Design a protein around this ligand. Structure first.
Ligand SMILES: Nc1ncnc2c1ncn2[C@@H]1O[C@H](COP(=O)(O)OP(=O)(O)O)[C@@H](O)[C@H]1O
Ligand SMILES: NCCC[C@H](N)C(=O)O
Ligand SMILES: [Mg+2]
Length: 356
C-alpha cells in the first residue's frame, strides 16, 4: 500500500469523524481501531481500503458508503464489512451463515391490493456475479465485453414467456434510453455513489439490457452487478411476478456459473445485496400515512421495509408514489424476504384504510 493512498485514507477518516451530520454506516462503524487494523492490507488484485470506502467518504449522504472491489475484500476488510453487514441486515453475527437457497411455496402468496387503489406496480429483482470475474472496479474494458458476450448469448436461449432480445447501450438511441429509464425498466446512467466507487469505468462498453417484448422480464448487464434479473408488471399480482422470476433464475442458473459463498450466500458488489440478493418492491400511494415521508419511513422500518423515491434510491417521491421494499437480504431465505414485503405492505394498506 503506497504512501499516497494512506494520505488520502488518513484524510478521509478525519473528514468522516468531523462530519457531524453524516448518518451513514461507514461513519458509524469505522472506528480508529478498525481503521488502523486494516488500512495497510491489500488483496491479490490490489484493492485497498480506499477503494472500499471512497464512495462513502466523498458522498456523506450515503446510507452505507462501502463496496467490495473483489470477493476477498469482504474478508481482508472484515472488521469494517462485518459490523456494517450485521447492522444493515437486522442481525447477522460473525459466526452466522446465510441459509441455503429456498424459493418456498409460491402458492401461498396473495394479491397485494385487490381493489387497485393503492398499488401501481410490483417488482422483484435478484443479482448475480459471474465466477472468474471480480466486481466492477477490478474489471478491464475487455472483460466487460467478454461478460456481455457470455450473458447475451445465454439469454438468446430463453424460451416462451422469457424469450427476448438483447439491447446494448452502445448504439442505443438517446431517445430510447431515456424512455426505458423514465418507464422504470432500464438502469439510470451516471450515479455518483457508483461513479466514485469506480464502478462505471469504460461506460457504456459492455453494458445493456435484455427483455421480453412485454418487458415483464428483464436482465441488466454490467451495471452495479454483473447481472440483475428482474420481473415486474402493473398491479399487485406478486405471486405471478415472483413465479416468473423463479422460473427465469432456475433456468439461467443451469447455464451460467455464479459466485456463491458458504457464509454470504450469493456474492454482490454492495454488502446490502448479499445472501438472497432479493429486493421485492411496490410502487404505492398511501396519501394519509405519507403526510410526511419521515413518518412513512418510521412506520415502514418497523416492518423491516425501506422507502425509496419514484426513480429509485436517493430520489424524491413524485405525485405521492413511493418505492417500498424489503430491506433485508442476508440471513433469511428468498421466501422469507419476499414475505416480509408482502406482509408489511398488506398491513400498511390496512393502516391507510383505517387512518383518518
Ligand atoms: N415496484 C416497482 N415498479 C416499477 N418500477 C420500479 C419498482 N421498484 C423499483 N423500480 C425502478 O427500478 C429502477 C432501479 O431503481 P433502484 O432504486 O436503483 O433499485 P435496484 O438497483 O435494487 O433495482 C428505478 O427506475 C425504479 O423506478
Ligand atoms: N445499494 C444501496 C447503497 C447505495 C450507496 N452506496 C449508499 O450507501 O447509499
Ligand atoms: Mg440500482
Amino acid at each position: 500500500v503506497d504512501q499516497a493512498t494512506l494520505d488520502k485514507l488518513e484524510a478521509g477518516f478525519k473528514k468522516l469523524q468531523e462530519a457531524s451530520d453524516c448518518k451513514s454506516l461507514l461513519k458509524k462503524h469505522l472506528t480508529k481501531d478498525v481503521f488502523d487494523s486494516i488500512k495497510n492490507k491489500k488483496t491479490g488484485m490490489g484493492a485497498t481500503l480506499l477503494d472500499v470506502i471512497q464512495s462513502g467518504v466523498e458522498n456523506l449522504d450515503s446510507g452505507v458508503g462501502i463496496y467490495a472491489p473483489d470477493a476477498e475484500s469482504y474478508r481482508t476488510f472484515g472488521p469494517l464489512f462485518d459490523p456494517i453487514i450485521d447492522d444493515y441486515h437486522g442481525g447477522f453475527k460473525l459466526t452466522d451463515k446465510h441459509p441455503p437457497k429456498q424459493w418456498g411455496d409460491i402458492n401461498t402468496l396473495v394479491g397485494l391490493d385487490p381493489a387497485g387503489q393503492f398499488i401501481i406496480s410490483t417488482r422483484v429483482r435478484c443479482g448475480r456475479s459471474l465466477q472468474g470475474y471480480p466486481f466492477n472496479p477490478c474489471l478491464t474494458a475487455e472483460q466487460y465485453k467478454e461478460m456481455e458476450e457470455k450473458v447475451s448469448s445465454t439469454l438468446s436461449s430463453m424460451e416462451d414467456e422469457l424469450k427476448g432480445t438483447y439491447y446494448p447501450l452502445t448504439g442505443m438511441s438517446k431517445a430510447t434510453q431515456q424512455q426505458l429509464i423514465d418507464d422504470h425498466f432500464l438502469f439510470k446512467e451516471g450515479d455518483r455513489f457508483l461513479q466514485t466507487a469506480n464502478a462505471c469505468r469504460y461506460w457504456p462498453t459492455g453494458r445493456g439490457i435484455f427483455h421480453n417484448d412485454a418487458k415483464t422480464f428483464l436482465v441488466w448487464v454490467n451495471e452495479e452487478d454483473h447481472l440483475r434479473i428482474i420481473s415486474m408488471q402493473k398491479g399487485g399480482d406478486l405471486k405471478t411476478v415472483y413465479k416468473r422470476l423463479v422460473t427465469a433464475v432456475d433456468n439461467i442458473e443451469s447455464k451460467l456459473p455464479f459466485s456463491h459463498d458458504d457464509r454470504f450466500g450469493f456474492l454482490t458488489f454492495c454488502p446490502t445485496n448479499l445472501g438472497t440478493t432479493m429486493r421485492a418492491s411496490v410502487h404505492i400511494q398511501l396519501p394519509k400515512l405519507a403526510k410526511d415521508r419521515k413518518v412513512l419511513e418510521d412506520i415502514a422500518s418497523k416492518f423491516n421495509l425501506q422507502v425509496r423515491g419514484t426513480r429509485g434510491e436517493h430520489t424524491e417521491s413524485e405525485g405521492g408514489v413511493y418505492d417500498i421494499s424489503n430491506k433485508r437480504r442476508l440471513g433469511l431465505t428468498e421466501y422469507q424476504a419476499v414475505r416480509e414485503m408482502q406482509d408489511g405492505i398488506l398491513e400498511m394498506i390496512k393502516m391507510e384504510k383505517a387512518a383518518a
